[PDB]
Design an enzyme around this catalytic site. Structure first.
Site, PDB file in Angstrom:
ATOM      1  CB  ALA B  66       6.647 -64.857  39.326  1.00 35.58           C
ATOM      2  CD  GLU B 112      -0.194 -64.802  34.403  1.00 38.68           C
ATOM      3  OE1 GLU B 112       0.893 -64.929  35.005  1.00 38.68           O
ATOM      4  OE2 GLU B 112      -1.244 -65.384  34.753  1.00 38.68           O
ATOM      5  CD  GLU B 132       2.064 -69.429  34.162  1.00 39.89           C
ATOM      6  OE1 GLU B 132       1.998 -69.864  32.987  1.00 39.89           O
ATOM      7  OE2 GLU B 132       2.086 -68.210  34.432  1.00 39.89           O
TER       8      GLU B 132
END
Ligand SMILES: CN(C)c1ccc(/C=C/C(=O)SCCNC(=O)CCNC(=O)[C@H](O)C(C)(C)COP(=O)(O)OP(=O)(O)OC[C@H]2O[C@@H](n3cnc4c(N)ncnc43)[C@H](O)[C@@H]2OP(=O)(O)O)cc1
Ligand SMILES: CN(C)c1ccc(/C=C/C(=O)SCCNC(=O)CCNC(=O)[C@H](O)C(C)(C)COP(=O)(O)OP(=O)(O)OC[C@H]2O[C@@H](n3cnc4c(N)ncnc43)[C@H](O)[C@@H]2OP(=O)(O)O)cc1
Ligand SMILES: CN(C)c1ccc(/C=C/C(=O)SCCNC(=O)CCNC(=O)[C@H](O)C(C)(C)COP(=O)(O)OP(=O)(O)OC[C@H]2O[C@@H](n3cnc4c(N)ncnc43)[C@H](O)[C@@H]2OP(=O)(O)O)cc1
Ligand SMILES: CN(C)c1ccc(/C=C/C(=O)SCCNC(=O)CCNC(=O)[C@H](O)C(C)(C)COP(=O)(O)OP(=O)(O)OC[C@H]2O[C@@H](n3cnc4c(N)ncnc43)[C@H](O)[C@@H]2OP(=O)(O)O)cc1
Ligand SMILES: CN(C)c1ccc(/C=C/C(=O)SCCNC(=O)CCNC(=O)[C@H](O)C(C)(C)COP(=O)(O)OP(=O)(O)OC[C@H]2O[C@@H](n3cnc4c(N)ncnc43)[C@H](O)[C@@H]2OP(=O)(O)O)cc1
Ligand SMILES: CN(C)c1ccc(/C=C/C(=O)SCCNC(=O)CCNC(=O)[C@H](O)C(C)(C)COP(=O)(O)OP(=O)(O)OC[C@H]2O[C@@H](n3cnc4c(N)ncnc43)[C@H](O)[C@@H]2OP(=O)(O)O)cc1
EC number: 4.2.1.17
Lengths: 258, 258, 258, 258, 258, 258
Positions: B66, B112, B132
């Site tokens: 993201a 993901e 992450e």
């Protein structure tokens, strides 16, 4: 300690190393050994300098199982007594990551102890197995549960019903272990892995570990909702802010565990 | 569209192709990109000519995650505003099959997104990972759930707690992806796969997909009962009569999606 | 029997062997065949001399699925009459271990029959697949459930939605089967495996099998509690004491199955 | 709107009231009505002044079910068109609390709509039932799931298999509804309840609602773990500090919704 | 039948009545009795004229439990490789609705037999209980599972740990039974209920029953998806067409059971 | 003990009584109180003379919740610290039955403590509630889980979202508590209940308690299989024979806890 050895490793002693040290019985996990193991685990868990724990045994054996001699004359009522094989799963309560460095034999309780850890590294000569069936009993510490969920029904059934052992290569291929290393560099590679982990935020690492473990306790739909809550909660920590700043600011991140 | 390129392809333009096209940020999935992606998906889902969808990115990157810069200064309260990272799992609601063709980087949200697809094809140089933890946060779009269910606890823990990436070979061996192809033929191989699927009854395919997805939402006993009901229900379609008649009549089946 | 061939092949005649024998329809599993199969299974289950069962077919085919001709003119209503494709899971009720020796084709119901067994051994030329989608229907005997839990979502989705077959090598790598052997020694290797199992206590083996099967019916936390109860209960048998005592006395020990 | 009436009859205008207004068909929930209902819900969900929503119908009927006339000429394929009786569970996605004030008839889809709400208040003459069986069909919006989990197997089976209606008294006794009020004060009592809720922190209320809903999606052990995480997360809000400080300081708390 | 009485009691023989008839042992359910019971059940299940089954015992006792004398000398061994206390849950396999009309004592296996039925009607003097604990054993036919799910933890714990009996009134209040009737009219009221059920489509009724039972086998989210599939499938029957048409035609419906 | 009082009250001193004794804070459960409570529980758990435990507080209050003043100035990180509101569920680990005798207020942590017990007896003036929402937080010790499973969604949602209290009568009707007694005889009635339990075999009682608790941790199908294994295992105890012979030999039960 009479059955284990402990020491701090890593660059900043951020890694706790525990070595099962009962050579005579191929590291058979007797009640006394478990006692000390849980102590060692607790101290490292409480030490704010340690971010990860490495568990290993000898070069010839990680652990040949629980002590057969100690359970030879026990009874069914001995089982509901409460003093028979207790505290074996204390390791599943440790919040910090635990890496098992497996060299040689990892049988019965030994294999089960390794599966209770979060990550498993195996030496080229490591061997895994659940020979309980050969003793007229069945795995009693997750051997039919953790094994099956990692390896698949066919291989788990074959291992549990025949008692046959599998090689480190087979274990890696099946997903039981995630890495294979030469017998002499195993423990070191494990420590390096523990080091990478110890460098991250201890509070964020603990949350990530919980999230992964939840994958075996609920449906995917709920697992994802839980994971999302945990993700949201990380936004209440300072390390999350520090971590994302270190990226855009293209510099190294320095986490302060909160 | 500004961040993506779409186009029908395959045998009868029966395959919908979506290409993430934001080269500068290694296909970082910003809010705007997700917006368009969901639009593209919806159009293909509604197009009665399209039977399957192929999702891919660049040659160097599928998606690096993201957009870190878009969430760098958000808050815990922002997470509960319902305006932070919303609509990411719209892809899990698409009834038609979706194949992810992964070349290069597939990190964080990228990895993901690939796991949300039904099938994953990887290029020889593809890389998967959940970094992450390095940003002081944890996977928040299924990285601790879908990954663990496919790869096993040890590898999932290692990936999530260290942030290390794995190769396409490792991903195939672990079951994360089902096929590896050369970087230059990947998207084509994916399209050919989508084509085989598109040739089958759209209504029967949708039922099969639901049945497989149910495998992660209930016990095996109930999963089998659900599957049975779905199987029974196919006997209420024309394509099922047409299909089983085409076998005994030694002829090609002509499904009418009815 | 008009469709199957049985016989006891153990080195001590302890292994029950069942061979699907309907060469002309590539062992298509018609209603009559299933009838006999369940009979054969029941007799071996009742025979106190048999400790394990081996299931195999021809060299060119294990089973090409259920008989397509027998179900082509059935209706939705037909399905809910309970007299259509009934008794297909009787094999999941057998308490004794069942090994599937798969040579050649194992498609649709054939693949599902193999997955219902506890262990699968495949011949170098074996091929697995779920082509139901090509007939305008979906797997109805566990093909979307057992397959997915062993192989992972991506490969399961690809197999079920396209109908493509996979090789024995792929099946072993994915965890669908646990061992590959040459076409001509397959059945023999399977029998040897059944033999090792037959040598262990029948009552302890039955408990171990139940424990492993439970891994797909409950959360890990509860699975471990169940396993523990089973483990405790083994302490109420004679074979357990005989099994552990035999160890400390460096002597072999055979169990009286109680 | 032609089928619904919405007005913020709350006091600080913090309570959103939605009234089904299709008297002729006893509030039969046709597609158009659902269409508007979801709109009304969304507006209130987005309005930062509204803290709770009250849903009610007429004095003689809450809703007699979905529109039977609209589904009489549909088919199996129609059901799998992707959009036949869609958006019927949008209400389960609303994060704010929703109270159903039920007067008179609440049958089929009407009863199911009430059960989808968080709290149900019934008028002295309210009647609940699932008469689908009388129309040759079964409940398809939670009537066999939510009903059974609240009322118990025996009463749920009796209701669903016979089609018989139960009184408000029976509903309260079985736990379907939590409070009974006179026909003429029902809606007000519901609004007063909505008011109490609206006075609490919106962000904390949303978390509490999620936690309660989770009780039907996972085991007790995991439900408690999830709840604990949500509890911890409240400590990252300002309202949690204000709330506990107001008790020690023996004063009224002023929640700012963060 | 030695210890059983059967007779079609519907106004069209649409109702099958089974009466436990072993007065001397307060209807103690011995192995022979269970044998006949399963036969009676099977015949009614196969009779296309019977749409529902009513199960009742004497006026003073429904059943005082399993035969204590028959299990007094059996042991652990007898429990595994044994047809010891087998076939006790055949009733859970019956597709048609089963109503238990309970007068007087319903203890241990008797209480459990009643809970296995879909609906329970109790006579004013009926008494329920699980006294297994007083005999040094625990409920072994669902007494700790079905009871708890209907009555709640507190009352279930109290009943199981003390052995105390509860009245018909308590049972109704707790949700164990759905209706209480005078001792003389009980069986009759039960038959009337069975009649209402028998009047509906047998195929739709069977689906509704399955859906309700699923409420105890999966999460609410999946339960609702399953229910939806079953609902959809009803649209493939003629009776669903008939039922909905009969309503709009303001006329009675004639279900053909297909 | 500075906050509680322990006592043996059985007819054979077989009942352990624990009384929360901190009158000034309406028995607010501060960290020190919990410390002692767990000690008291452990001693009684270890005392082979005690077969059941009774937990009660004052006449005006059972417990008004956890100590609000002790958590007023705590941080989100204080939660993940490792020792904030720790050891609250030790009571769920006690193998022996625990009865909660509730008089007066049972709010927040107090209500949750009562629900953790196996059985709850309430005084005519008892009041239950979860007012956490009023303090800007949510139940964190099972208030959204155990409450909901006992009382139903509507009442649980109303209680948790409004903070309103319910009477003893309401609690009994909803299934939260199993019996109501006069304020003066409550504790005595609880002790009598504990006595009946203490008279049964300790080992059988422990098994029955585990089986009932399992009803909230797995599907009904698996719950029944677990229960059956526990039932089988009772046949390996002496008390089972002693108990079943005592009935057949029309004499009073003879128990030896094994
Ligand atoms: C919490 N709950 C409920 C539970 C928790 C845990 C458990 C665990 C159960 C088990 O692990 S059952 C044990 C499963 N393991 C086994 O069956 C492995 C037994 N070991 C072997 O077969 C062999 O020793 C071997 C590991 C293949 C290596 O063979 P080899 O190289 O010939 O060495 P060998 O001479 O046999 O072993 C050297 C010494 O270690 C001892 N030893 C080996 N394994 C042992 C064990 N598990 N316990 C105690 N001693 C052991 C040998 O007896 C011998 O000691 P002495 O005879 O000199 O006194 C259960 C329940
Ligand atoms: C619905 N819910 C609740 C949720 C939904 C989704 C998510 C997702 C979270 C994430 O994905 S966190 C993101 C995971 N990614 C990471 O941790 C780091 C990703 N990037 C990297 O490690 C490296 O950039 C790399 C992909 C290995 C490539 O490195 P290298 O070859 O040296 O190229 P590099 O110069 O670094 O990158 C090229 C450009 O892409 C940008 N970029 C790379 N990854 C980016 C990302 N994830 N976001 C934004 N920009 C990114 C770089 O900053 C740079 O732009 P400029 O600064 O020059 O303007 C969470 C919750
Ligand atoms: C409990 N419940 C709810 C349930 C339980 C079970 C099931 C199972 C359903 C299925 O299995 S559906 C069927 C899945 N299997 C298939 O679709 C395989 C279809 N077969 C093939 O594609 C090919 O025959 C093949 C296996 C690749 C072999 O090809 P090839 O070597 O060229 O031989 P081929 O000539 O086609 O076949 C040889 C003979 O076997 C027959 N045969 C092959 N598979 C058959 C089958 N599944 N059923 C009946 N006959 C079959 C052929 O019709 C032919 O017989 P003739 O009429 O020509 O004399 C469902 C529900
Ligand atoms: C997301 N998915 C997959 C799903 C989502 C939702 C659903 C829901 C299904 C259902 O609700 S099936 C329907 C369940 N409801 C019923 O069976 C109730 C049917 N109604 C009745 O039995 C009776 O009308 C009554 C409510 C007892 C009231 O009786 P009474 O006082 O005599 O009124 P009555 O004249 O019969 O009805 C008044 C008018 O409302 C209409 N009406 C009543 N209920 C209706 C309904 N459910 N649908 C359509 N119109 C209805 C009547 O047809 C009549 O219109 P006219 O004939 O005058 O044109 C399924 C799936
Ligand atoms: C699938 N699997 C694994 C499983 C399947 C099933 C089960 C079930 C187990 C159980 O049900 S254990 C049984 C639970 N029942 C009990 O504990 C005893 C219940 N009955 C009683 O306590 C008393 O009979 C009572 C109902 C309270 C009232 O009787 P009362 O009016 O005092 O007369 P009483 O003389 O006691 O009983 C009358 C006759 O019935 C017999 N009887 C009563 N209950 C009996 C029983 N459960 N079994 C055998 N005989 C029984 C008595 O022995 C007596 O016969 P005589 O010796 O006088 O000729 C377990 C596992
Ligand atoms: C394992 N983990 C993660 C977890 C484990 C546990 C928990 C539990 C949390 C809670 O329970 S939050 C607290 C929930 N309880 C409440 O909100 C109840 C608050 N109390 C009240 O509203 C009222 O005191 C009442 C009990 C309804 C009746 O009181 P009333 O008769 O009016 O007298 P009142 O003066 O208020 O109370 C008498 C004294 O007890 C104190 N007190 C009452 N409840 C208290 C409490 N929960 N904590 C501390 N002090 C308390 C009062 O402050 C007062 O002391 P002074 O201010 O005079 O020094 C969370 C997480």
């Amino acid at each position: 300690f009479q059955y284990i050895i402990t020491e701090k490793k890593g660059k900043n002693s951020s890694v706790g190393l525990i070595q099962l040290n009962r050579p005579k019985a191929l590291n058979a996990l007797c009640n006394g050994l478990i006692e000390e193991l849980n102590q060692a685990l607790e101290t490292f868990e409480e030490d704010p300098a340690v971010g990860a724990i490495v568990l290993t045994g000898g070069e010839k054996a990680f652990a040949a199982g629980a002590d057969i001699k100690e359970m030879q004359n026990r009874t069914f009522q001995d089982c509901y007594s409460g003093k028979f094989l207790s505290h074996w799963d204390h390791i599943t309560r440790i919040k910090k990551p635990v890496i098992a460095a497996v060299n040689g034999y990892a049988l019965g309780g030994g294999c089960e102890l390794a599966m209770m850890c979060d990550i498993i590294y195996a030496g080229e000569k490591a061997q895994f197995g659940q020979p309980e069936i050969l003793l007229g009993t069945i795995p009693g510490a997750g051997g039919t549960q953790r094994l099956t969920r990692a390896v698949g029904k066919s291989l788990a059934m074959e291992m549990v019903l025949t008692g046959d052992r599998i090689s480190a290569q087979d274990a890696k291929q099946a997903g039981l272990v995630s890495k294979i290393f030469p017998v002499e560099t195993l423990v070191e590679e494990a420590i390096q892995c523990a080091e990478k982990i110890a460098n991250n935020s201890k509070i964020i690492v603990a949350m990530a570990k919980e999230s992964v473990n939840a994958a075996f306790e609920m449906t995917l739909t709920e697992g994802n909702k839980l994971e999302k809550k945990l993700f949201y909660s990380t936004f209440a920590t300072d390390d999350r802010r520090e971590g994302m700043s270190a990226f855009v600011e293209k510099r190294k991140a320095n986490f302060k565990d909160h």
